[PDB]
């Protein structure tokens, strides 16, 4: 309806912690970054909707900010704010951004981002891109929307496991910006499992790299567990 | 006048540098009055013409911010950009990330299409850069069909005439064959543009076309630079 | 029985880590022996990767029931050890032990507690894009003529555990044995199957000794 | 029908280097001396020539120059190569970033096509140099439809006579199969050149093309040296 | 069938492919290549890593300056000999690991008189060409006729060539790789040759990966390499 009109851009923002550049010392640290994360929340412009700990996932990489917004603009001064003006920016490298533009779906308007929808972020989170096949787009529109429903039929089997399928065109290498939230990390590796089972992935050309980690609570619990 | 726009030698480079942590620091007002210097110097010896800056924040790892400059010959161009590096600290806290070359020419069908910076036309508020390499088989294709295919290629973007492009030869300039810059007024428009250009025939005949920068044109250096992680 | 398993790949950075090393090693031990203490993250083995390809030195084999735990022992390794602070991450193979399509008794040699090998072979995997589609009794009988062709290596031991979602891959694979030329000829011998026309990526390999405590693998670090 | 100039042993090697930001410093006159004494006691001795010195800034993130140099033994590059890294401050202070080895052989259809170099023509004033990498089938190919690809191909670059080619083997001597550079007065007739000769049926033969390398041949070091950055 | 027991020997084979430090070695390089060639002393005394060569690769890549080809009954023994070359000497000290490939001696599928140059004792070539080699996903389970076919034309191909000796070496599950390769002729234009000439095989139909190639110029003894490199 409105959902299917409205504005926003989304952004994975992937961080690498810095060994030796953060320190022991972290309660102050962390203050600061809280403090950084409430005035955004007031602002009412860049909606944080996680933090997460990435640690074990891959090398060279150990947090994710998931922030969202109606103009790119507004994320673009956060992610600088947050770089330029938190020591958690300050001792943290940029490894990855994924990047995406909320448009209705081609064939379904029903099919709606979890975060559009404003549903509550699930405790565990995998992102990653997406590059369909070259002939995807330009394929007979039915085969293509059956394809689809096929591919929707086959994730039914995990109603407690919410999709953001996002476009990313221009914002980055790729095609689409996929977020998967569940509860259990256990039930986003079986949805992946059985979504090979589907004519979708002969349409395939790229899908990684896999960002995939547990949303903090707070600011606190992912400060103190990175490398100082 | 479309016969002489077609015949003018113009290089273009977009010029990619992502900022050295921790090497600027928080005194940058020498810096930005360097650079502002070495820029206002570039357009009186009036040979390499900017056509923006660009701020790349938020795009990717490892880019932060662009050059995009023009100039009769490539070695004015080479000059320029050895001269950033060399003679300014901002070049010289900077690194390389990537450099996209090109050299204008006319179309291959259609002689009214040229680049937007060839038309004279205002720089767009936003871009987005990228190479491009066509498929092995697109050049000897028969002509009649990879014309109809650019013609329906063209027709696919009829929505986006606020979109300009610069679609622009870039062979034994670098590693690609095309070098590819869309202007407009706001990002939305750049990426709906790309989207609806998947749905052409075009599309089953192409082996590259990354790495995109895109990011927001800048007024002046002062506003770019601090920007700027120190 | 529900497990996630890691593999922890490490790089040794040269100058790091000195030849002070025997309060590192104290220190890591203690580590060690802290999480055997806990219970959570089982330690099935610490390797010696020396000259198996550059930019990694050792591995560490770790098991638990819940991913956090793993996470949590990564992030503390690499946070409270002096061994981990000086060390790179090299890259992880992550992965949740789930059942056999087809044959239910195929289990991880470390699902079934079976003695760890003494060498052994890591890889992630993932198969071709139309492997999962195809036909099922045509993979069932493609999987299990891949299986027959390993009857003559029964000393080597298979942990074939599926990765979806836990990083760029979908299997991570590891071959434990005695001796490291069964692990080659096995290898060999697996590559005349059927199964090798339905492969998209099986890099980067991981090949190590088993050592006895951290102390082994300290010493014989470039340092 | 050039039985000598087939016949005869010639290693080729373009040896591209990355200035490494901050090493080179402020004071060159004493290095571009150094620099020119090292060339000129090669020159001296006999065994290597050095064809060009280039210039390749603004090609591509990661290179600033590059020698062209070649010697009947490849032993005697390995040598020169080394002594320029060891013993002459602009080799230490610089990185290697590529290079590009291959031995002349006579062509396998047309004897009378031989490298620029090996027929002693003066070297182009700008260059562009590039690994080659066949299709896995076109060796196999039966040889009268190879010949006639490659004729085609050769009747494809018949405007083009001002670029001078230099096509060599380039097997076991680093990951590729031939070594091409192609150089020329004017730099836009080498991009004119690449353009038109995608359109050969001998592209559909093709698995590898890149890095390539582009630049201006200096008249001496201190053109080159003066450029980089410090 | 005249060359059973040397078709039945465990040998494992490395090639460990190092760079130099710009600026670690310094100009007085005596006491680095008195400990090296100390080092590689030792080793021939303790009679288990024997060193095959060491050869000079200034030239030929980026990123790759020498290399030690060495050969141990146990896959364990190069494993402490590449460690403590690293630990314990200044030389490999300055160095860093580029690449390392390694490889276990098996009998030949089909032709078991093709052995590697190392197992048959050869006297090490003056030059070589070392490069990993990977097969199309359609070699192995391909009909064993056909495969029999295919290479017996490509040893046919190699005819000319009696002067350059192969080592065609396992290489499955230690690294990235099926096969090690390595090449050894009196005359680098011999090996250029070869590989030119063996294109023209229907073997390479069915090729992946063989990548990144090292080449370089066996030295005589420690003291040459070391003085070629960047101080």
């Known amino acids: 309806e409105e959902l299917?009109?409205?504005?926003?851009?989304?952004?994975?923002?992937?961080?690498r912690a810095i060994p030796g550049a953060?320190?022991?010392?972290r309660a102050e640290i962390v203050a600061q970054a809280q403090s950084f994360f409430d005035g955004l929340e007031t602002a009412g412009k860049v909606e944080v909707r996680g933090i997460y700990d990435?640690?074990?996932?891959?090398?060279?990489?150990?947090?994710?900010?998931?922030?969202?917004?109606?103009?790119?603009?507004?994320?673009?001064?956060?992610?600088?704010?947050?770089?330029?003006?938190?020591?958690?920016?300050?001792?943290?490298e940029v490894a990855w951004l994924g990047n995406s533009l909320h448009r209705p779906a081609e064939f379904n308007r029903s099919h709606l981002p979890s975060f559009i929808m404003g549903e509550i972020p699930g405790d565990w989170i995998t992102v990653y891109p997406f590059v369909r096949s070259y002939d995807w787009y330009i394929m007979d529109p039915q085969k293509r929307?059956?394809?689809?429903?096929?591919?929707?039929?086959?994730?039914?089997?995990?109603?407690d496991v919410r999709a953001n399928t996002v476009p990313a065109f221009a914002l980055g290498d790729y095609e689409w910006m996929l977020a998967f939230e569940a509860?259990?990390?256990?039930?986003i590796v079986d949805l992946m499992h059985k979504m090979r089972y589907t004519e979708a992935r002969l349409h395939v050309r790229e899908e990684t790299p896999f960002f995939t980690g547990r949303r903090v609570s707070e600011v606190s619990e992912l400060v103190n567990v990175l490398p100082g």
């Open 145 to 159: 929307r059956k394809i689809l429903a096929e591919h929707g039929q086959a994730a039914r089997d995990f109603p």
């Open 54 to 92: 990435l640690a074990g996932c891959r090398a060279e990489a150990d947090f994710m900010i998931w922030w969202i917004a109606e103009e790119f603009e507004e994320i673009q001064a956060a992610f600088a704010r947050f770089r330029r003006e938190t020591v958690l920016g300050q001792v943290s």
């Open 183 to 187: 509860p259990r990390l256990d039930r």
């Open 22 to 25: 953060l320190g022991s010392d």
């Open 4 to 15: 299917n009109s409205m504005q926003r851009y989304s952004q994975f923002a992937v961080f």
